[PDB]
């Protein structure tokens with residue numbers, strides 16, 4: 001209740017919260033706190049959509065490209081309504097999987113000579129077809 | 130002073146765009162009051178029910194055949210007030226229309242929704258009208274609360290919680306994914322009254338669509 | 346389950362097991378592969394399903410595949426594919442190698458740059 | 466005003482602002498010196514006096530000097546000397562640097 005969520009990334013599992021604590025009583029001596037929580041996977045591979053990819057042992061977390069806003073907002077100017085660009089900075093790699101997303105693959109299946117490629121489910125359960 | 134019987138917005142594409150035409154007693158004329166802010170345009174749009182005012186401007190008169198006379202009173206309206214009847218007007222007098230310019234107003238297309246692909250309606254894929262195009266709604270966040278809001282608007286009764294076993298009978302879509310991350314908390318009256326991301330921005334695929342089955 | 350630690354020391358061969366449990370009825374189809382290449386019907390074996398003593402109505406079976414010690418030490422990948430009616434997409438697959446599954450050590454590197462950037 | 470951090474992040478230059486208000490009458494002269502050596506007049510742009518709408522009778526202006534990113538990072542110092550008749554010694558100075566700020570802390574936790 002006393003914390004405000006800024007970003008809730010799922011691919012990098014990054015979550016940032018900010019909070020002001022009323023330390024002492026002088027209004028000019030209150031500290032501003034920034035919390036970062038990162039969960040890293042140790043079993044996932046380089047490309048989450050290809051099981052043959054090698055393992056990944058290097059993780060990079062840029063905070064300038066995480067707390068960024070990229071959706072035009074509406075602004076009232078007393079004579080019209082316009083769309084405004086939040087940031088000008090606006091291929092990112094997905095470290096972990098997303099529950100709200102489904103991951104599938106193509107695999108050759110041989111039986112009596114004939115080969116039937118069928119869609120698989122890399123994720124354990126995720127969504128249903 | 131005359132009381133406006135209605136507005137018609139003639140000489141424009143459809144009836145949500147054109148020139149402001151106040152209905153004077155008997156014969157009606159065009160109005161070019163000064164200080165025409167968006168607040169008066171909002172009341173004008175609400176008169177017709179088109180939707181939200183988006184733009185208002187005065188255009189140069191280059192042989193536009195402005196035969197319609199001009200009014201002789203102002204219509205200072207707070208915008209949040211009611212129909213043109215309930216907003217103060219000056220006591221007749223002279224006109225503020227010095228430069229001969231017509232007043233323009235641009236309302237928006239009204240909202241609509243339907244279910245496509247289900248038998249006898251009340252079931253199927255969700256399509257929402259906006260900008261004169263129908264499109265699909267993403268299922269990234271589709272709780273049970275977001276299901277009942279659509280059902281009562283079309284009068285299909287309370288949803289019976291059909292799960293996803295029978296949601297494969299409608300298939301995917303081909304239209305643009307207009308809405309995403311829809312979160313409806315209360316009943317409200319319409320889906321647009323909820324909190325969404327934006328019109329045209331999504332991170333979904335036509336495979337992941339929303340299927341709603343009400344009681345019928 | 347990856348091959349046992351004390352089996353690789355003899356440097357003869359390695360055995361990988363694919364355990365599938367908790368299903369009904371008792372008709373399953375397990376096929377092994379190596380980095381997208383279907384393997385021969387002769388290198389792996391499978392057993393008929395048998396009842397589970399703990400929970401009645403759910404069965405289990407397993408498939409055993411053998412591989413050369415040098416081939417497994419190189420770092421090749423293997424996949425287990427099972428076909429049954431109960432699955433949503435009706436086929437699932439899982440992948441194991443040397444680096445994943447009872448490993449020796451864990452090497453991780455982390456970089457956190459632009460920690461004082463603009464958030465707004 | 467210390468330079469914007471995002472401007473430095475993008476790595477072109479930096480913006481130093483010298484905001485001076487609350488003087489009367491309208492007579493002010495600001496200069497830019499580095500390490501005790503005044504800089505050329507072609508290094509900063511000087512604004513002009515203009516009344517403050519809130520408090521009548523007060524004027525204010527400012528001056529901005531652009532510095533190279535490497536020069537700002539190397540630790541060079543800058544200052545904005547001001548001259549006004551009403552001042553006691555007719556000279557007042559404010560000085561900032563990269564190190565100008567409040568010491569921060571890092572409560573890093575690693576859960577193996």
Ligand SMILES: *[C@@H]1O[C@H](CO)[C@@H](O[C@@H]2O[C@H](CO)[C@@H](O)[C@H](O)[C@H]2NC(C)=O)[C@H](O)[C@H]1NC(C)=O
Pocket residue numbers: 047048049050
């Ligand atoms: C990670 O894996 C995916 C899936 O194999 C790669 O993208 C696929 O590329 C093939 C052709 O090589 C297409 O048939 C698929 O449609 C692609 N997938 C999707 C979802 O479009 C992707 O290129 C791989 N990334 C890297 C860096 O190798």
Ligand SMILES: *[C@@H]1O[C@H](CO)[C@@H](O)[C@H](O)[C@H]1NC(C)=O
Pocket residue numbers: 033570572
């Ligand atoms: C360090 O973490 C503890 C909780 O583990 C917290 O009480 C404390 O405030 C943190 N230190 C700082 C400087 O925020």
Ligand SMILES: [Ca+2]
Pocket residue numbers: 100101268269337
């Ligand atoms: Ca989804």
Ligand SMILES: [Ca+2]
Pocket residue numbers: 267269309310331332
């Ligand atoms: Ca989304």
